[PDB]
Symmetry: D2
Subunit: 213 residues, 4 copies
């Protein structure tokens, strides 16, 4: 039979969008169609508030919006652990934590866009030891993005290439037109974002006056 799998998505989810959710569904259908995996759960892990140099709605609101957005999902849930930590954590550490939480144990894989795969190649960005542990001890399910050639990223990277069997490229459209950056700008100008992000998230944004300019 099949290897049980849990999908983990890291990011700011500022706010979570229809596209971020779409990614899980495409990743799950892809892993199932290989006939050797059974995705048993998805986890949305919003980044903690100390991260980056770009403003984010408070983690409290980002976790709430993800929870509201996931109410109609019977397999994806938001986990606030990462955002509740005192400080920002490297991706590999969130994976270790959730892996330990699962501990004939399911394989925990990082769900991301092909653009994340390109960042591995950025100098001073990732510790090679981290890139390796991620693709070797956990795995990557990358969903395509216009302008990116995941296959080329994999072939040109010695580490990815050696562990490419742990990198699953999901080939199926995934709403690459909506960026959360656009969603925030539209909200700031009083424009509608309905049908781009869940109705329940729009309601929370309105009720709590988020994303105002």
């Amino acid at each position: 039979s099949r290897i049980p799998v849990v999908l983990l998505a890291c990011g700011s989810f500022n706010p979570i969008t229809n596209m971020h959710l779409r990614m899980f569904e495409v990743a799950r259908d892809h892993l199932h169609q290989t006939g050797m995996y059974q995705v048993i759960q998805g986890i949305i892990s919003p980044v903690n508030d100390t991260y980056g140099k770009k403003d984010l709605a408070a983690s409290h609101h980002r976790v709430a919006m993800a929870r509201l957005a996931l109410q109609t999902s019977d397999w994806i849930r938001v986990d606030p652990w990462e955002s509740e930590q005192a400080q920002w954590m490297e991706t590999v550490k969130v994976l270790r934590h959730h892996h330990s939480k699962l501990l004939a144990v399911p394989e925990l894989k990082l769900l991301c866009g092909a653009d994340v795969l390109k960042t591995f190649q950025t100098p001073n960005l990732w510790k090679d030891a981290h890139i390796q542990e991620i693709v070797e001890k956990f795995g990557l399910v990358c969903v395509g993005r216009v302008s990116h050639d995941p296959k080329g990223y994999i072939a040109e990277s010695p580490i990815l290439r050696m562990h490419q069997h742990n990198i699953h490229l999901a080939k199926e459209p995934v709403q690459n037109e909506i960026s959360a950056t656009y969603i925030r700008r539209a909200l700031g100008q009083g424009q509608s974002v309905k049908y781009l992000i869940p109705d329940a998230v729009i309601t929370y944004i309105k009720d709590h006056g988020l994303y105002t300019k």
Copy 2:
């Protein structure tokens, strides 16, 4: 103050998608931002069952799915009149009907993608008298589509060019990746289409065994 406007969308809505709904929101924000219109309502008019040579779920189901999809909309509604007619009707006739239904009367405009605008140029497809009445007596709100140059379509067509003030080009992204054709194929192969079309439409499709291969 402003000219009241009703937006009418024709098409098969087989099934209605997040993108079809997105189109109304983008069209409404665009007309409002010109400062001279106030959109008071949107109407989804599914094509009747005698149309075309491509299979469509029965009009009964297409109207039901649109109604379920529009439950969280406070300004767009599905109107079954067109689909309840004995036979297929030309676009201009559906516009005349809904216009008469509104009868200092709001301006009724056809909402469509820029690809419809290209079809006007197709020989033996549209009666010039229809193209003219549509852009002159009613109006068009076109939402962009990749691969199309609406401005060029307008300039190269003598009729559109003469009445171009009645053709509003909404410039704002609109989920041009999802075609209802793709949605149907995915459903037929047992793949997920969640976050591409409304949850309520997916539920109806499942409950009534629609789009099976």
Copy 3:
């Protein structure tokens, strides 16, 4: 390995890098299957009596196509269709070229996925013609943004019956240029360099086209 000739119809008003890329993608796709060897490409501009509107004179479009193809060692423009008295249905251009091949390789129509969607347009194509195209000849489809070729095929009672003769070539590069935008840009005095061949841009300027 079966010899294949690819035929592309359209207005080529003007021919663009996308029209050109279309042949290359289609050819690599057919070769990848292993059962075909593409020996020639043919660009056949539509004649002037056609419907549309601002169509540049056929000899101009044929000349631009020839210039765009100077660096191609396997694709050529064939003026026959543009030189006929009046517009002709696609099937008829395919029969003409089939007759020339015999005076043998398989002649296939090359087009974008958008063309497949037009097959459904009521009163636009005769079913008999669609059937002849995929049954007597063949169809090689190059992907285009927003189109789902596989669904077009599955939903057409005619197309799904001839899947062996319909080849879907995926276009991993979103190189979607529309000639309409090319013409409008030229009209506004803007650059289209690197969107269409340099020789075509020079020809256009020399002959005061699309102003």
Copy 4:
């Protein structure tokens, strides 16, 4: 009307039609504003000590850029940056070229909207450099699918303060080719004709690059 020189940095491994189109769009955009006259374009390939991996030798990338630009009467490749001992930050290449201009026009960095998004990447750019780029020089941004330049600008405390020196040029044509795909395709023996210049394809073949 202020004279403007556009400077594009990157690996150009190899230069593609998109990199080229980028200059044309940026130039028409700047001229459209009416307050600028673009007098020169400069392609500055990154030197070999750079991070990445499978970078073709700099003289090869500079040679391909030169070949791609033979038909350009306003854009040129400048090997200075690729000839330095080691990699250099972007600001430093801008200072060097500013110094050459003086020995005056405004020197602006030309890049895609994706570059603007990298400004947010923690520990990737120094704020001082981002500030100098948009305050001392300028930034001309060409649109890219999936990117929202206006939001990048509004959300950056540094960028939103220098909006007069940041020019967003819209790319109405989704001509999005990635050099990574170009290299992979060449590696598999597939065609990239009409995606990059013919002379660059010939150069690549002659020198056994990207095999």
